[PDB]
Amino acid sequence: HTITNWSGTHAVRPKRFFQPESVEELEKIVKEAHEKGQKIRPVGSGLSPNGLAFSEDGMVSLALMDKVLHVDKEKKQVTVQAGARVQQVVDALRPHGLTLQNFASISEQQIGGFIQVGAHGTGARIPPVDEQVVSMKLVTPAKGTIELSEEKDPELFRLARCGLGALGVVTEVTLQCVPRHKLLEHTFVATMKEVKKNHEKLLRENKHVRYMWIPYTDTVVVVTCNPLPEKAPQYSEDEKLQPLRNLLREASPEVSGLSFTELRDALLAVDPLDTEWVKRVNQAEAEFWKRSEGYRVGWSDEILGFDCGGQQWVSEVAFPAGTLEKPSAADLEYMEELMRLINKEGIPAPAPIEQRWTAGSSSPMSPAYSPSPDSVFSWVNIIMYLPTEDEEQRKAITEAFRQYRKLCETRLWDKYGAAEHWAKIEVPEDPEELEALRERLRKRYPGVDKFNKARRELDPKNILSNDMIDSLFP
Ligand SMILES: Cc1cc2nc3c(=O)[nH]c(=O)nc-3n(C[C@H](O)[C@H](O)[C@H](O)COP(=O)(O)OP(=O)(O)OC[C@H]3O[C@@H](n4cnc5c(N)ncnc54)[C@H](O)[C@@H]3O)c2cc1C
Ligand SMILES: O=C1O[C@H]([C@@H](O)CO)[C@H](O)[C@@H]1O
């Protein structure tokens, strides 16, 4: 079994690959893996953009353990085997009239890999998915199967539920659900100025708010979602795509089939590191979005999904933007600086730069860790696309993205106290940078020392961790 992430930027062929169908079977696997000092890193769907779960030596998947065990019809709660995919849990929950509190744009993630990185959606009053776990069962190399909750070692619970697969193998999760609801989704464009005006009130008046920023333009695409009490409040598809189709014809039945995202991919392909060419692609996409204002209605699960496009490099940071009651302007200032920089340094940055918001997490490891609840994090995701399979063109884009991320890395993350998403962080080779990174992790995470202490307490032989984990927590 050879195993590759979504963007095929990372792949691994583990010497050992285990896929147990029962806790009993997994209990054994770790017991024996412990007894022998053999690596077994937990893996979910393997989709993490940075290969977090990848180990040459050994990996365990709970893909076959994916049943919904119990529904508490009253406390609005599902207990689910860790191997269940988000999609699988949305389907099972449907007839029980329940849904998850939030979704992370794709739904192929396993609950394990979903919670272990503190995945998030958007919505200023909605935490990342760590704060959605009531209880978990975790299989430890040292203590065996232990039950965690706000009651059973709540100190460990919060450190475990977001443990980057390093504190044990999660077998069960009880999740705080909300009632299955339809959602009204509003898409519109705006200027920086128009954003700044309605921003503070927009976050607070709208359940979900996401901004797609389009570099080398003053077009920001805003997407609000709110529950439909009772329903929905024009350009043709051909007319929406005309600018991108017209731009590609400059440099057909080949074209007429391509989706909006295939056109971007096919446009970027032409010359993805020439900044002037990207200027033109981004302007055309801005026009598309200008021709795509409107409303949709659907179930939260259908609406909070987002088509992310082709294979890609991405980097998302979570940084503090005050509290509900004391608004901050870090979030829009962050964006101003970043768009000042891309122009100043001639970065061939395609669209979109995705800015979202979450409530704080009580999970020490969450990149939106706050002691104060009703705190607010802005998340900002940068992207370069890999439109083709030319390893040549794919290594220039890899270069340029590292430089793009590196420039944010210095100029912004320190200033704003920005912590990287656990699924997107890349361990740099240059030993300067790795020590540079390490001092930043300490700087942004108080619970670090306590996290390696739980690693020795629960996995003293270190069979659950890979190079990545060792390099980040030395
Ligand atoms: C196209 C795309 C869009 C995305 N959008 C979002 C988004 O909107 N929001 C967001 O927050 N993230 C997003 N992500 C990132 C994604 O949520 C994470 O990569 C997620 O962790 C993937 O889940 P997985 O099951 O594939 O995890 P894997 O990559 O398989 O594993 C993730 C982590 O969990 C551990 N693990 C997995 N299963 C278990 C288990 N049973 N017990 C213990 N540890 C376990 C692994 O060791 C690893 O540390 C996106 C990724 C892609 C590719
Ligand atoms: O990993 C991710 O990929 C998407 C991004 O590519 C948006 O274009 C999600 O928003 C998330 O940040």
Numbering used by the authors: 10 to 239, 242 to 244, 249 to 266, 284 to 506
What does the paper say about this structure?
In photosynthetic organisms, L-ascorbic acid is produced in the Smirnoff-Wheeler pathway by the multi-step conversion of D-mannose-6-phosphate to L-galactono-1,4-lactone, the substrate for the final biosynthetic enzyme, L-galactono-1,4-lactone dehydrogenase (GalDH) [EC 1.3.2.3]9,15. GULO, ALO, and GalDH are generally named aldonolactone oxidoreductases and form a group of sequence-related flavoenzymes belonging to the vanillyl-alcohol oxidase family. They oxidize the C2 carbon atom of their monosaccharide substrates and thereby generate the characteristic, redox-reactive C2-C3 double bond of L-ascorbic acid and its analogs. GalDH is a dehydrogenase that reacts poorly with oxygen.
The structural comparison shows that the only conspicuous change between the substrate-binding sites of the two enzymes is the replacement of Gly413 in GalDH to Asn363 in GULO (residue numbers refer to vGalDH and mGULO). We sought to unveil the role of this amino acid exchange by introducing the G413N mutation in wild-type and A113G GalDHs. Encouragingly, however, we found that the single G413N mutants had sustained activities. Both G413N sGalDH and vGalDH displayed a selective decrease in the KM for L-gulono-1,4-lactone and no drastic alterations in the KM for L-galactono-1,4-lactone or the respective kcat values. We further performed the crystallographic analysis of G413N vGalDH at 2.3 Å resolution using crystals that were soaked in a solution comprising L-gulono-1,4-lactone. The B-factors of the bound sugar were notably high. However, despite this, the electron density was of sufficient quality to conclude that the conformation and orientation of L-gulono-1,4-lactone are highly similar to that of L-galactono-1,4-lactone bound to the wild-type enzyme, with the obvious exception of the 3-hydroxyl group position. The substrate-binding environment is likewise mostly retained in the mutant structure. The only differences affect Glu386, which shifts towards Arg219 and no longer forms an H-bond with the ligand, and the newly formed H-bond between the ligand O3 and Arg388. The carbamide group of the introduced Asn413 is nestled on the sugar ring and in van der Waals contact with the substrate O3. Collectively, these data demonstrate that the GalDH versus GULO distinction can be primarily explained by very few amino acid changes in an otherwise remarkably well-conserved catalytic cavity.
